[PDB]
PDB file of C-alpha atoms and ligand atoms in Angstrom:
ATOM      1  CA  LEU U   1      12.496 -15.144 -10.551  1.00  0.00           C
ATOM      2  CA  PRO U   2       9.664 -13.407  -8.542  1.00  0.00           C
ATOM      3  CA  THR U   3       6.681 -15.553  -7.315  1.00  0.00           C
ATOM      4  CA  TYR U   4       3.236 -14.033  -7.560  1.00  0.00           C
ATOM      5  CA  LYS U   5       0.623 -15.539  -5.375  1.00  0.00           C
ATOM      6  CA  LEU U   6      -2.536 -15.250  -7.088  1.00  0.00           C
ATOM      7  CA  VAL U   7      -5.847 -15.923  -5.392  1.00  0.00           C
ATOM      8  CA  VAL U   8      -9.121 -16.918  -6.878  1.00  0.00           C
ATOM      9  CA  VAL U   9     -12.179 -15.875  -4.953  1.00  0.00           C
ATOM     10  CA  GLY U  10     -15.942 -15.998  -5.877  1.00  0.00           C
ATOM     11  CA  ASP U  11     -19.202 -17.774  -4.987  1.00  0.00           C
ATOM     12  CA  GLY U  12     -19.589 -21.563  -4.943  1.00  0.00           C
ATOM     13  CA  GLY U  13     -19.889 -23.032  -8.436  1.00  0.00           C
ATOM     14  CA  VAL U  14     -18.655 -20.034 -10.475  1.00  0.00           C
ATOM     15  CA  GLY U  15     -15.748 -22.108 -11.988  1.00  0.00           C
ATOM     16  CA  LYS U  16     -12.761 -20.964  -9.730  1.00  0.00           C
ATOM     17  CA  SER U  17     -11.272 -24.374  -9.803  1.00  0.00           C
ATOM     18  CA  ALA U  18     -12.174 -24.849 -13.426  1.00  0.00           C
ATOM     19  CA  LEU U  19     -10.059 -21.759 -14.425  1.00  0.00           C
ATOM     20  CA  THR U  20      -7.317 -22.859 -12.222  1.00  0.00           C
ATOM     21  CA  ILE U  21      -7.212 -26.484 -13.598  1.00  0.00           C
ATOM     22  CA  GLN U  22      -7.591 -25.312 -17.141  1.00  0.00           C
ATOM     23  CA  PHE U  23      -4.577 -22.782 -16.578  1.00  0.00           C
ATOM     24  CA  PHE U  24      -2.264 -25.439 -14.989  1.00  0.00           C
ATOM     25  CA  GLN U  25      -3.420 -29.016 -16.330  1.00  0.00           C
ATOM     26  CA  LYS U  26      -5.177 -27.915 -19.645  1.00  0.00           C
ATOM     27  CA  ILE U  27      -8.223 -29.949 -18.900  1.00  0.00           C
ATOM     28  CA  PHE U  28     -11.821 -29.222 -17.937  1.00  0.00           C
ATOM     29  CA  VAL U  29     -12.713 -29.818 -14.202  1.00  0.00           C
ATOM     30  CA  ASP U  30     -15.484 -32.353 -14.950  1.00  0.00           C
ATOM     31  CA  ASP U  31     -12.835 -34.480 -16.758  1.00  0.00           C
ATOM     32  CA  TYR U  32     -10.197 -33.997 -14.176  1.00  0.00           C
ATOM     33  CA  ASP U  33      -8.797 -36.523 -11.722  1.00  0.00           C
ATOM     34  CA  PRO U  34      -7.607 -34.740  -8.604  1.00  0.00           C
ATOM     35  CA  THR U  35      -6.316 -37.940  -7.125  1.00  0.00           C
ATOM     36  CA  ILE U  36      -2.773 -37.014  -8.157  1.00  0.00           C
ATOM     37  CA  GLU U  37      -2.812 -33.277  -7.543  1.00  0.00           C
ATOM     38  CA  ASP U  38      -0.195 -31.234  -5.908  1.00  0.00           C
ATOM     39  CA  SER U  39      -0.047 -27.278  -5.565  1.00  0.00           C
ATOM     40  CA  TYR U  40      -0.688 -25.030  -8.613  1.00  0.00           C
ATOM     41  CA  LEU U  41       2.808 -23.666  -9.405  1.00  0.00           C
ATOM     42  CA  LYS U  42       4.281 -22.785 -12.724  1.00  0.00           C
ATOM     43  CA  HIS U  43       7.179 -21.087 -14.452  1.00  0.00           C
ATOM     44  CA  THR U  44       5.922 -18.878 -17.378  1.00  0.00           C
ATOM     45  CA  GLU U  45       6.976 -15.890 -19.501  1.00  0.00           C
ATOM     46  CA  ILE U  46       4.622 -12.784 -19.396  1.00  0.00           C
ATOM     47  CA  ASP U  47       5.833  -9.831 -21.405  1.00  0.00           C
ATOM     48  CA  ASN U  48       9.287 -11.242 -21.789  1.00  0.00           C
ATOM     49  CA  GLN U  49       9.572 -11.574 -18.127  1.00  0.00           C
ATOM     50  CA  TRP U  50       9.952 -15.010 -16.519  1.00  0.00           C
ATOM     51  CA  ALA U  51       7.912 -15.531 -13.337  1.00  0.00           C
ATOM     52  CA  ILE U  52       6.682 -18.212 -10.944  1.00  0.00           C
ATOM     53  CA  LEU U  53       2.831 -18.168 -10.571  1.00  0.00           C
ATOM     54  CA  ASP U  54       1.555 -19.790  -7.370  1.00  0.00           C
ATOM     55  CA  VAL U  55      -2.230 -20.006  -7.542  1.00  0.00           C
ATOM     56  CA  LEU U  56      -4.511 -20.166  -4.596  1.00  0.00           C
ATOM     57  CA  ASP U  57      -8.010 -21.536  -5.403  1.00  0.00           C
ATOM     58  CA  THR U  58     -10.371 -20.829  -2.508  1.00  0.00           C
ATOM     59  CA  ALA U  59     -13.546 -22.759  -1.853  1.00  0.00           C
ATOM     60  CA  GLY U  60     -16.464 -20.548  -2.339  1.00  0.00           C
ATOM     61  CA  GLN U  61     -19.023 -21.737   0.161  1.00  0.00           C
ATOM     62  CA  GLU U  62     -19.367 -19.541   3.243  1.00  0.00           C
ATOM     63  CA  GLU U  63     -18.522 -22.465   5.571  1.00  0.00           C
ATOM     64  CA  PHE U  64     -14.794 -22.178   4.439  1.00  0.00           C
ATOM     65  CA  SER U  65     -13.433 -19.186   6.040  1.00  0.00           C
ATOM     66  CA  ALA U  66      -9.964 -20.175   7.282  1.00  0.00           C
ATOM     67  CA  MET U  67      -8.784 -20.926   3.673  1.00  0.00           C
ATOM     68  CA  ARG U  68     -10.274 -17.857   2.287  1.00  0.00           C
ATOM     69  CA  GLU U  69      -8.778 -15.747   5.283  1.00  0.00           C
ATOM     70  CA  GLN U  70      -5.382 -17.166   4.922  1.00  0.00           C
ATOM     71  CA  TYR U  71      -5.216 -17.067   1.130  1.00  0.00           C
ATOM     72  CA  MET U  72      -6.331 -13.513   0.979  1.00  0.00           C
ATOM     73  CA  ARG U  73      -3.858 -12.315   3.549  1.00  0.00           C
ATOM     74  CA  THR U  74      -0.937 -13.823   1.458  1.00  0.00           C
ATOM     75  CA  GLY U  75      -2.067 -12.956  -1.985  1.00  0.00           C
ATOM     76  CA  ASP U  76      -0.298 -10.695  -4.399  1.00  0.00           C
ATOM     77  CA  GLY U  77      -3.430 -10.167  -6.387  1.00  0.00           C
ATOM     78  CA  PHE U  78      -6.976 -11.423  -6.982  1.00  0.00           C
ATOM     79  CA  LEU U  79      -9.312 -12.760  -9.489  1.00  0.00           C
ATOM     80  CA  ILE U  80     -12.801 -12.143  -8.386  1.00  0.00           C
ATOM     81  CA  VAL U  81     -14.888 -14.628 -10.297  1.00  0.00           C
ATOM     82  CA  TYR U  82     -18.595 -14.778 -11.001  1.00  0.00           C
ATOM     83  CA  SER U  83     -20.785 -16.994 -13.302  1.00  0.00           C
ATOM     84  CA  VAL U  84     -22.702 -15.076 -15.936  1.00  0.00           C
ATOM     85  CA  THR U  85     -25.423 -17.592 -15.391  1.00  0.00           C
ATOM     86  CA  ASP U  86     -25.631 -16.814 -11.719  1.00  0.00           C
ATOM     87  CA  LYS U  87     -26.988 -13.353 -10.840  1.00  0.00           C
ATOM     88  CA  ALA U  88     -26.250 -13.773  -7.167  1.00  0.00           C
ATOM     89  CA  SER U  89     -22.640 -14.628  -7.804  1.00  0.00           C
ATOM     90  CA  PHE U  90     -22.411 -11.335  -9.716  1.00  0.00           C
ATOM     91  CA  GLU U  91     -24.107  -9.281  -6.866  1.00  0.00           C
ATOM     92  CA  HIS U  92     -21.524 -10.785  -4.457  1.00  0.00           C
ATOM     93  CA  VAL U  93     -18.702  -9.303  -6.300  1.00  0.00           C
ATOM     94  CA  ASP U  94     -19.243  -6.185  -4.238  1.00  0.00           C
ATOM     95  CA  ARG U  95     -18.776  -8.128  -1.166  1.00  0.00           C
ATOM     96  CA  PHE U  96     -15.765  -9.861  -2.352  1.00  0.00           C
ATOM     97  CA  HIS U  97     -14.100  -6.603  -3.240  1.00  0.00           C
ATOM     98  CA  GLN U  98     -14.770  -5.202   0.168  1.00  0.00           C
ATOM     99  CA  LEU U  99     -13.427  -8.297   1.777  1.00  0.00           C
ATOM    100  CA  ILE U 100     -10.122  -8.279  -0.064  1.00  0.00           C
ATOM    101  CA  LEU U 101      -9.612  -4.482   0.954  1.00  0.00           C
ATOM    102  CA  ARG U 102     -10.477  -5.273   4.621  1.00  0.00           C
ATOM    103  CA  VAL U 103      -7.939  -8.227   4.788  1.00  0.00           C
ATOM    104  CA  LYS U 104      -5.182  -6.168   3.108  1.00  0.00           C
ATOM    105  CA  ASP U 105      -6.082  -2.868   4.942  1.00  0.00           C
ATOM    106  CA  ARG U 106      -5.714  -1.023   1.488  1.00  0.00           C
ATOM    107  CA  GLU U 107      -8.001   1.144  -0.398  1.00  0.00           C
ATOM    108  CA  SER U 108      -6.972  -0.498  -3.741  1.00  0.00           C
ATOM    109  CA  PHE U 109      -5.278  -3.794  -4.441  1.00  0.00           C
ATOM    110  CA  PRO U 110      -4.332  -5.828  -7.719  1.00  0.00           C
ATOM    111  CA  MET U 111      -7.664  -7.340  -8.873  1.00  0.00           C
ATOM    112  CA  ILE U 112      -9.385  -8.521 -12.134  1.00  0.00           C
ATOM    113  CA  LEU U 113     -13.087  -9.053 -12.345  1.00  0.00           C
ATOM    114  CA  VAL U 114     -13.608 -12.440 -14.248  1.00  0.00           C
ATOM    115  CA  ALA U 115     -17.132 -13.079 -15.827  1.00  0.00           C
ATOM    116  CA  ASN U 116     -16.949 -16.846 -16.298  1.00  0.00           C
ATOM    117  CA  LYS U 117     -19.105 -19.448 -18.226  1.00  0.00           C
ATOM    118  CA  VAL U 118     -19.729 -17.172 -21.218  1.00  0.00           C
ATOM    119  CA  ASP U 119     -19.995 -20.347 -23.458  1.00  0.00           C
ATOM    120  CA  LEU U 120     -23.431 -20.681 -21.977  1.00  0.00           C
ATOM    121  CA  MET U 121     -25.031 -18.283 -24.342  1.00  0.00           C
ATOM    122  CA  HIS U 122     -28.699 -19.251 -23.827  1.00  0.00           C
ATOM    123  CA  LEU U 123     -28.278 -19.361 -20.118  1.00  0.00           C
ATOM    124  CA  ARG U 124     -26.591 -16.050 -19.751  1.00  0.00           C
ATOM    125  CA  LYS U 125     -28.181 -13.755 -17.149  1.00  0.00           C
ATOM    126  CA  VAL U 126     -25.455 -11.081 -16.531  1.00  0.00           C
ATOM    127  CA  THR U 127     -24.830  -8.932 -19.641  1.00  0.00           C
ATOM    128  CA  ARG U 128     -21.287  -7.913 -20.871  1.00  0.00           C
ATOM    129  CA  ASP U 129     -22.227  -4.230 -20.210  1.00  0.00           C
ATOM    130  CA  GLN U 130     -23.172  -5.016 -16.619  1.00  0.00           C
ATOM    131  CA  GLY U 131     -19.909  -6.724 -15.974  1.00  0.00           C
ATOM    132  CA  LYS U 132     -18.016  -3.720 -17.463  1.00  0.00           C
ATOM    133  CA  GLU U 133     -20.074  -1.392 -15.223  1.00  0.00           C
ATOM    134  CA  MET U 134     -19.076  -3.287 -12.149  1.00  0.00           C
ATOM    135  CA  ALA U 135     -15.418  -3.369 -13.046  1.00  0.00           C
ATOM    136  CA  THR U 136     -15.351   0.372 -13.967  1.00  0.00           C
ATOM    137  CA  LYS U 137     -16.994   1.190 -10.750  1.00  0.00           C
ATOM    138  CA  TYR U 138     -13.975  -0.273  -8.880  1.00  0.00           C
ATOM    139  CA  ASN U 139     -11.484   0.881 -11.492  1.00  0.00           C
ATOM    140  CA  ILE U 140     -10.475  -2.744 -12.241  1.00  0.00           C
ATOM    141  CA  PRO U 141     -10.040  -4.642 -15.427  1.00  0.00           C
ATOM    142  CA  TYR U 142     -12.796  -6.813 -16.712  1.00  0.00           C
ATOM    143  CA  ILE U 143     -12.424  -9.965 -18.731  1.00  0.00           C
ATOM    144  CA  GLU U 144     -14.802 -12.784 -19.902  1.00  0.00           C
ATOM    145  CA  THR U 145     -13.904 -16.442 -19.613  1.00  0.00           C
ATOM    146  CA  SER U 146     -14.763 -20.005 -20.384  1.00  0.00           C
ATOM    147  CA  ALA U 147     -13.044 -22.906 -18.615  1.00  0.00           C
ATOM    148  CA  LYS U 148     -15.012 -25.370 -20.807  1.00  0.00           C
ATOM    149  CA  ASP U 149     -13.247 -26.688 -23.862  1.00  0.00           C
ATOM    150  CA  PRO U 150     -12.421 -24.785 -25.928  1.00  0.00           C
ATOM    151  CA  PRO U 151     -11.301 -22.368 -23.250  1.00  0.00           C
ATOM    152  CA  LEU U 152     -11.510 -18.635 -23.644  1.00  0.00           C
ATOM    153  CA  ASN U 153      -9.181 -16.076 -22.106  1.00  0.00           C
ATOM    154  CA  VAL U 154      -7.871 -18.426 -19.343  1.00  0.00           C
ATOM    155  CA  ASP U 155      -4.136 -17.691 -19.871  1.00  0.00           C
ATOM    156  CA  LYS U 156      -4.901 -14.022 -20.626  1.00  0.00           C
ATOM    157  CA  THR U 157      -6.728 -13.762 -17.288  1.00  0.00           C
ATOM    158  CA  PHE U 158      -3.857 -15.071 -15.167  1.00  0.00           C
ATOM    159  CA  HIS U 159      -1.315 -13.145 -17.158  1.00  0.00           C
ATOM    160  CA  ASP U 160      -3.097  -9.888 -16.934  1.00  0.00           C
ATOM    161  CA  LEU U 161      -3.414 -10.128 -13.243  1.00  0.00           C
ATOM    162  CA  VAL U 162       0.572 -10.431 -13.053  1.00  0.00           C
ATOM    163  CA  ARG U 163       0.593  -7.358 -15.353  1.00  0.00           C
ATOM    164  CA  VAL U 164      -1.552  -5.511 -12.966  1.00  0.00           C
ATOM    165  CA  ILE U 165       0.628  -6.529  -9.836  1.00  0.00           C
ATOM    166  CA  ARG U 166       3.802  -5.332 -11.858  1.00  0.00           C
ATOM    167  CA  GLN U 167       2.364  -2.027 -12.812  1.00  0.00           C
ATOM    168  CA  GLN U 168       0.798  -0.938  -9.538  1.00  0.00           C
TER     169      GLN U 168
HETATM  170  N1  LIG N 201     -20.350 -24.202 -19.124  1.00  0.00           N
HETATM  171  C1  LIG N 201     -19.372 -24.110 -18.300  1.00  0.00           C
HETATM  172  N2  LIG N 201     -19.374 -24.750 -17.074  1.00  0.00           N
HETATM  173  C2  LIG N 201     -18.402 -24.250 -16.304  1.00  0.00           C
HETATM  174  C3  LIG N 201     -17.441 -23.449 -16.355  1.00  0.00           C
HETATM  175  N3  LIG N 201     -16.480 -23.416 -15.386  1.00  0.00           N
HETATM  176  C4  LIG N 201     -17.074 -24.227 -14.448  1.00  0.00           C
HETATM  177  N4  LIG N 201     -18.115 -24.848 -15.003  1.00  0.00           N
HETATM  178  C5  LIG N 201     -18.916 -25.763 -14.309  1.00  0.00           C
HETATM  179  O1  LIG N 201     -19.316 -25.176 -13.071  1.00  0.00           O
HETATM  180  C6  LIG N 201     -19.406 -26.162 -12.097  1.00  0.00           C
HETATM  181  C7  LIG N 201     -18.535 -25.830 -10.850  1.00  0.00           C
HETATM  182  O2  LIG N 201     -17.172 -25.754 -11.241  1.00  0.00           O
HETATM  183  P1  LIG N 201     -16.002 -25.585 -10.196  1.00  0.00           P
HETATM  184  O3  LIG N 201     -14.819 -25.267 -10.977  1.00  0.00           O
HETATM  185  O4  LIG N 201     -16.062 -26.701  -9.380  1.00  0.00           O
HETATM  186  O5  LIG N 201     -16.564 -24.300  -9.449  1.00  0.00           O
HETATM  187  P2  LIG N 201     -15.818 -23.553  -8.127  1.00  0.00           P
HETATM  188  O6  LIG N 201     -16.040 -22.252  -8.300  1.00  0.00           O
HETATM  189  O7  LIG N 201     -14.410 -24.127  -7.891  1.00  0.00           O
HETATM  190  N5  LIG N 201     -16.774 -24.224  -6.829  1.00  0.00           N
HETATM  191  P3  LIG N 201     -16.369 -24.232  -5.237  1.00  0.00           P
HETATM  192  O8  LIG N 201     -16.467 -22.913  -4.684  1.00  0.00           O
HETATM  193  O9  LIG N 201     -17.470 -24.992  -4.555  1.00  0.00           O
HETATM  194  O10 LIG N 201     -15.064 -24.877  -5.184  1.00  0.00           O
HETATM  195  C8  LIG N 201     -19.018 -27.557 -12.629  1.00  0.00           C
HETATM  196  O11 LIG N 201     -20.422 -28.127 -13.079  1.00  0.00           O
HETATM  197  C9  LIG N 201     -18.239 -27.075 -13.906  1.00  0.00           C
HETATM  198  O12 LIG N 201     -18.433 -27.892 -15.043  1.00  0.00           O
HETATM  199  C10 LIG N 201     -17.353 -22.787 -17.725  1.00  0.00           C
HETATM  200  O13 LIG N 201     -16.625 -21.852 -18.162  1.00  0.00           O
HETATM  201  N6  LIG N 201     -18.349 -23.064 -18.577  1.00  0.00           N
HETATM  202 MG1  LIG N 202     -13.457 -25.141  -6.411  1.00  0.00          MG
END
């Protein structure tokens, strides 16, 4: 089977780990005990094609560059995650896009823009159409997620990234 290395990037606190842990462990990050953790690897069927997904969950704080650098270098595709309740995380999408292309030395690369935390309806700052505009600007797909139970579009997000990788 092919292995797809999927790298999750975005500002601190946007829910990169929450999306990853929901995808693999089917639990919300707050309820999770990382004590017994290992790497995020699964065998799964996408569009009638079995694959191994190896997910690399970056820490979002600027302090942690070695992890982000290495992870970016080895990635086959990226989720650029922001929180719809955090305007700065959305503005930082531009920087993440540029950073990925710099690390890859390519002018395009498999990516999906992920607007997380959409369950927080009364706290939402970044609109659906704002997200769609940002994605369209870079000619990348846009998807809204929630890692909080009940999860929204979590499996679809990772599966769609594989679809983009396959069809590039
Ligand atoms: N309501 C809601 N809260 C969420 C969602 N995803 C994450 N959170 C919350 O956001 C906070 C940060 O989540 P976490 O997954 O640690 O974020 P991160 O992007 O991995 N942070 P870091 O970059 O520091 O590792 C937690 O309080 C968590 O409960 C979501 O979809 N909805
Ligand atoms: Mg994290």
